[PDB]
């Protein structure tokens, strides 16, 4: 239940598929010992202690779903 105006006429610009170009390998597995991508406790922090916490977490060393964005075609300006 809101508002919002349409921008322009219903004529979308052309879209290509060139996923072969986007195929590349930049492996960055997450190192839990390096403290990457860990969900903090939601409302009860701690200090200077080692504690076991049960929750939602990722596996160590996952290649994941790496994606890359690219610019469109252009000739001059």
């Amino acid at each position: 239940v809101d508002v919002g105006p349409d921008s322009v006429k219903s004529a979308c610009i052309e879209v290509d598929i060139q996923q072969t170009f986007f195929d590349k390998t930049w492996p960055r597995p997450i190192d839990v010992s390096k403290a990457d991508g860990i969900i903090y406790p939601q409302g009860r922090t701690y200090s200077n202690i080692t504690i076991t916490y049960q929750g939602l977490f990722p596996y160590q060393g996952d290649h994941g779903d790496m994606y890359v964005y690219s610019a469109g075609h252009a000739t001059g300006t």
Binding site: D2, K9, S10, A11, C12, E14, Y67, Y69
Partner: protein, 49 residues
């Protein structure tokens, strides 16, 4: 990045995967990423070129 989340999966007009029925959550950055707009709203396709 831009995120699209939902609970229904279907095909487009040409049969390609990607259509999400009913209310859909969309995360989208704007203003060169300064703004982080989010909305769980109804989306409708366009029938143009």
């Amino acid at each position: 990045p831009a995120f699209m989340l939902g609970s229904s999966v279907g095909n487009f007009s040409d049969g390609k995967m990607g259509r999400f029925f009913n209310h859909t959550l969309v995360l989208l950055p704007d203003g060169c990423g300064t703004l982080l707009r989010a909305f769980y709203c109804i989306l409708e396709p366009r029938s143009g070129n």
